[PDB]
């Protein structure tokens, strides 16, 4: 109650000043739930789906890629994300194939930071399939 | 008179917007269309020396352009398409160019009969 939820891509805007009681965000260092007066933090995101529960009967299943959640002192949040798409624009069939090919290059990485780049890529496709 | 009355109006709308062609990509899709028809109507107007045509062959080439049957063909190919299309309709559609020469007008029967002709040729053309 008496909240404000803002959800904006760089090119488009989903929510402006319209809050619905509960926001689920995948944090880099875990996960959290927003329930009308959460103790404010400054967190950053991991690849994972955002399921905003509208009042409105049902929920809203978005899927962010990397953004920033700023819940602040007054009861108002500002969730800004870079690639915030829904579910139906994605195809599951291409997401299955992209996993094991990046696992195949993981053994074939000679350097230490180039292999660390491969570990970033397999994590994002892992949250891709399990969200589907 | 029937086809060239719209061609005269179509070319006159092009000459208004000829000064936007040198730097134009951020314009409206109607203005991009008005440039697209004006270039392709111009290539129909070019003509070699000592080759005078007939009025029944002239009205067919204008009918191919003013209807909209050329806005997907590349602007450099409009000359090669025209010399191919004219030698077709002389030998294979001689009985249509005797019903515009003798009739004088273009009826509703000849409007449909010319309509599948330029759709048959445009379908398999590039070979």
């Amino acid at each position: 109650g008496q909240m404000s939820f803002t959800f904006a891509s760089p090119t488009q805007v989903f929510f402006n000043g319209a809050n619905v009681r509960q926001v689920d965000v995948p944090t880099q260092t875990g996960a959290f739930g927003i329930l009308a007066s959460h103790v404010p933090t400054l967190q950053v995101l991991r690849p994972g789906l955002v399921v905003v529960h509208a009042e409105d009967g049902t929920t809203s299943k978005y899927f962010v890629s990397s953004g920033s959640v700023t819940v602040n002192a007054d009861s108002s949040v500002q969730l800004l994300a870079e690639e915030a798409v829904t579910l139906d624009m994605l195809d599951p069939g291409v997401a299955k194939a992209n996993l094991e090919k990046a696992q195949s290059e993981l053994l074939g990485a000679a350097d230490e930071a180039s292999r660390a780049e491969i570990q970033i890529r397999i994590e994002a496709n892992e949250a891709l399939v399990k969200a589907l | 008179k029937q086809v060239a009355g719209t061609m005269k109006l179509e070319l006159a709308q092009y000459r208004e917007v000829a000064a936007f062609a040198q730097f134009g990509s951020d314009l409206d899709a109607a203005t991009q269309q008005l440039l697209s028809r004006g270039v392709r109507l111009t290539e129909l107007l070019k003509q070699g020396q000592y080759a005078p045509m007939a009025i029944e062959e002239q009205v067919a080439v204008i009918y191919a352009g003013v209807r909209g049957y050329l806005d997907k063909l590349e602007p450099s190919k409009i000359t090669k398409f025209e010399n191919a299309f004219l030698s077709h309709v002389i030998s294979q559609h001689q009985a249509l160019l005797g019903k515009i020469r003798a009739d004088g007008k273009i009826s509703e029967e000849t409007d449909a009969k010319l309509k599948e002709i330029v759709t048959n040729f445009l379908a398999g053309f590039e070979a």
Partner: protein, 48 residues
């Protein structure tokens, strides 16, 4: 701290890769909006 930490990376270098994978899992219809953003146009000029 993670594997992209303590190996010498930045969070933009993290955020470039995980957002690039979402633009590869899109369909043929929404591939143009992945071509739309595609922000590789700024050149690099350092004097040395």
């Amino acid at each position: 701290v993670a594997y992209w930490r303590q190996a010498g990376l930045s969070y933009i270098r993290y955020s470039q890769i995980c957002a690039k994978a979402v633009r590869d899992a899109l369909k043929a219809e929404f591939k143009a909006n992945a071509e739309k953003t595609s922000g590789s146009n700024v050149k690099i000029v350092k004097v040395k």
